[PDB]
Amino acid sequence: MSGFRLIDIVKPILPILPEVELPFEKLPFDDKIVYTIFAGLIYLFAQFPLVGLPKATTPNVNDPIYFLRGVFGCEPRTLLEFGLFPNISSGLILQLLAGLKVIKVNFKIQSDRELFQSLTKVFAIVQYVILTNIFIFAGYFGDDLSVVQIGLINFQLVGAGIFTTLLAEVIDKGFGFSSGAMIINTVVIATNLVADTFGVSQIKVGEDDQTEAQGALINLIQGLRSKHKTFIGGIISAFNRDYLPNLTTTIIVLAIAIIVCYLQSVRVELPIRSTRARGTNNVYPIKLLYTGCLSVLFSYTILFYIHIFAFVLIQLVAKNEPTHIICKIMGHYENANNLLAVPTFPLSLLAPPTSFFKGVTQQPLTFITYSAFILVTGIWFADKWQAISGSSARDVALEFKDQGITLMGRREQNVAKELNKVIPIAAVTGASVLSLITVIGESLGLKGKAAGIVVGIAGGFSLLEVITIEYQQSGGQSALNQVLGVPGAM
């Protein structure tokens, strides 16, 4: 419509599109656990294909893209090829507008707090529709068509992708534990890890990359150890051969796991004085890795989104052949004279060099630039996190400080000033050493959950810390029986 009216809002097309609205009832505690494993069982069906039969026959889709997979929360060639990718992206966009301060919002008012939340989920569905027109301009599917079933395929992914942003919301309304953003990231590791390492071996051939030889743990250890039902023997340790060592991919899920679960165990210890006594008391640690968790999700997402220098949006302009303002000067994604063909020289030096083999030590220059960029982006979103609410440095420090002195009643001192020395200089660099440790674990190797595993077993040890403290200090089956509790005073 038009008429003569002054508008710029696209109000009338909004209820003409079947969007979403979300629950309603929630139930704990046996119906939190039941409905959040039910959520993970609808995700589980990634075995199912996607409709499209000229691309599922002879080409059977092009080779798996192992770079997107770990941060999307996706599986290729199914209903959930995008996962959380546009949902987190609408978080990147509005973390950028709010935190750059082109748009300025103070989030302690109810009206504009929930304006932000509503705007994000609308922009997640706007980002969904443009992502599925990005993914057919990528040339991933092994065919490019005029509008026929290339129109239907993009509809399907969006119609099961507005579902995966419903999963995020349903869990978050209290009908599941944790957040459904965290959960789908930590069952990406579940799908990918034991497909890779336990697997099963089958016999078929294929010139292109196929999943025929997979199940590294069984292949390696049982040939080393003895013999099985399968007739095997001999030890395969390390090779640069076409056939995988099997040892290589077994080591590099463990290697990262040890050192990224221990970076959260490096903690910032904060004294208090006391709880009942006059004298030394709690060592009160704060999580190192979990503060920077949403900061480094923003940081890692953007390395697969930038037009100037990232994977998805330069694979489009390599595929598309008119050369103008946008051209494959952004990067060249094509077959190479090199034995292994991944982009020969792009401007994507923000690309991870790792694959599901060993790292790359043959180019130190691309290593340095990659590490440098993600540390800069890891402190970019650290100070946007500080700027945009949460437990703000200014607000919380100010609040307790003047609340305490004159109150009630009354009261006096806190440790807030002396830990405003410690906390804000540990917050920014706490997402700069998290972006450093994800890359150095990736350097060893591992792909297709390269950085998904790291935040999923240290997101599984973050989970462990919360539940153990609840059990043993708040009540339940407890360990307070050994020595407790608070003594002093008189």
Partner: peptide, 21 residues
């Protein structure tokens, strides 16, 4: 307000549709 069973029904009928076609 919709319900948490409407979202549940939508997906399991979508998964059914894809295998069928």
């Amino acid at each position: 307000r919709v319900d948490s069973l409407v979202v549940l029904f939508l997906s399991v009928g979508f998964i059914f549709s894809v295998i069928a076609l």
